[model samples]
Target: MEVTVPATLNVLNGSDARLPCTFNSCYTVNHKQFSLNWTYQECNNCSEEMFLQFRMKIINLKLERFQDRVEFSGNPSKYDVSVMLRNVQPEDEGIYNCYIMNPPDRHRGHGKIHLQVLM
Candidate 1:
């Protein structure tokens, strides 16, 4: 399996930004067997912040900073793992990391994107 994401996304402050993420895999996404994670970091020197996780039908948002401001917009049927960040602020500009694991495959795949918040 392999994860794919745009190199960068630009959006105006206060507007929503859609970070595209998708995966190419031999196995179909079986909600009961797949794990997906989205993480973020402010800069190259910063530790990663867990943004969200998806398993089966469950979705968990790990950070209060993202509460009510983000959502998963991907379709499992299509192997999409995209997410939308709403009402973005200057502080929201950074790098996003996506991790996907489809079990029995033995290896995990990852992708990253840089979000540019413009005034």
Candidate 2:
């Protein structure tokens, strides 16, 4: 499987942003065995921060900063792992990493997107 993401996303502050992530896989995703995660880093040298996770359903373990602003917008059956970030702020500029794990697959696939929030 291979994950794909946009190279960059530009959004105005106070607006919404969509970070798309899609994947190519040899096997159909099984909801029970599927695991997806999104992480972010404020800067190139900053440590990654957990944004959200999804299994059979969206998990509740999201970073406090993004807890109420993020939502899963992808369709697993379509191999989309995109997410929506609402109410963007200047501080939201960062790099986002998307990771997907499908059962019976030994390797996980990932992609990255750089987001720029403007005034």
Candidate 3:
């Protein structure tokens, strides 16, 4: 399994942010056998919570602090599981983890990107 993401991203406060997350595996396009876990962390060792997810081809299966403000912006069939944040705030600045799992891949794809919220 392979996950790809930019190590850093910047978005103006109150602006929208699209965190692009892509993945690759030994086998592709397993609707029922694939899943995505997208989480947020305010600090390196701080507690992390999920804000978006893709399980059994589902999107935003759950929401956290970003409730009602998250958007699914990718197609699993295309190997992309990116998500967008609407009107991101200062507190939204943190690390975003994108974990993609496709059964039989041996390892789950994991990637993280730092979000910098600026005025």
Candidate 4:
């Protein structure tokens, strides 16, 4: 249950930033009872808040502040969860959390991503 991102990401404002997340666990014995989620941990508290939640599919970060500027990519079946942040902004600088949840055991795997915005 580890998530990884580029050691150094250099993306211009109005561009896109992609963060990839991966997961590994022993919760499911048959290897078919697990799910992945792209989550944002707010305030550095792992158990405090949940910003965004998703199982599979890129979360479109297209808002008034980031319209048509961001998106995400990755395959859950392969355990590759990645993000594409378009129209990148300095305000977008923050830590992104990638997590996995096991329904049967109610267990989870989580990882962190530090995003650096380039001016």
Candidate 5:
């Protein structure tokens, strides 16, 4: 399996940031058999904070910094596992990790997108 994401995305301070993450798997993907997760990291050595998840549905818990601000905007059936984080601020600028696991594929798919908030 393989995941693809853009190198960096630039957005206005109050605008929404679209993270495009697509994946390829050896076998067909199913909602029950496959899962996807999105996490954020402020630094290279910082611990990742999982912000969004997709099993049979999209979930963003209150414990996450992006709680209600993130929205699932991609169609998993099309191999697009993208998302939108609204009203992005300076603190939201960081690395977004997209991980997709399909047991049948054996290998995990990972992609990273850096968010850069501009004035």
Candidate 6:
């Protein structure tokens, strides 16, 4: 019916966290309209789209707060979108959202992950 993912996460510092979102519907997906983005809910508003298609690999794993992160492999046709956050820190503890666009009406499907960073 819509795209969504689990909301609970547990990760330790210097480790990796995987947050995934799945779409459950047959809709026309435009590569230009579909994007995966993350938000630290507590910060208000959202950053920009972090991914498109969710079909390729985001090799730039070492960047800012999410260093050494990667998208899950093994499946893409199944609409499995999972982002990896590496070297996690306390600041990474927050709500991570995946946003997808669905058509003419501009309806969006979203999933949120609550990250708990452990020292």
| Candidate-wise lDDT, in order | 0.86, 0.86, 0.85, 0.58, 0.85, 0.59
Instruction: Encode model 1's per-residue lDDT on 4-34: one tens digit a residue.
Output: 8998889999998989999988887788888
Question: Against the hidden reference, what TM-scores do the models get?
Answer: 0.91, 0.90, 0.91, 0.64, 0.92, 0.65
| By TM-score: ranked, best first | 5, 1, 3, 2, 6, 4
Worst 10 residues of 3 by lDDT: 56-65
| Candidate 2 whole-model C-alpha lDDT, 0 to 1 | 0.86
Error of 4 at 92 (Å): 0.5
Kindly report which residue pairs in candidate 4 clash with one another: 14-87, 69-86, 69-87, 70-86, 72-84
- The per-residue C-alpha lDDT of model 2 at residue 17 equals 96
Q: Give the TM-score of candidate 4.
A: 0.64
Point out the higher-scoring one by lDDT: 3 or 6: 3
Q: Which RMSD does model 2 reach against the true structure?
A: 1.5
Off by over 4 Å in 3: 59-64
The TM-score of candidate 1 is 0.91
Give the per-residue lDDT of model 2 (tens digit) for 54-86: 867887566677758888888987999899998
lDDT of 4 by residue, 18-117 (tens): 7766665434422354555555443465442333345343344334544564455766656666766766788766667767765564556777776777
Query: For candidate 3, lDDT tens digit of each residue in 13-56?
Result: 99999999988775877888888889888889999888777777
Return the lDDT, model 1, position 30. Answer: 84
Give one digit per residue, the lDDT tens place, for model 6 in 1-119. 37677878888887877777777647655554444444446444645334323323323324455544544431334666666665677777777777654454356678778788888
| Pairs in steric clash, model 1 | none
Candidate 5's TM-score: 0.92
Per-prediction CA RMSD (Å) = 1.4, 1.5, 1.5, 4.4, 1.4, 4.1
Give the deviation of candidate 4 from the true structure as CA RMSD.
4.4
Candidate 2: segments with Cα more than 4 A from true spot: none
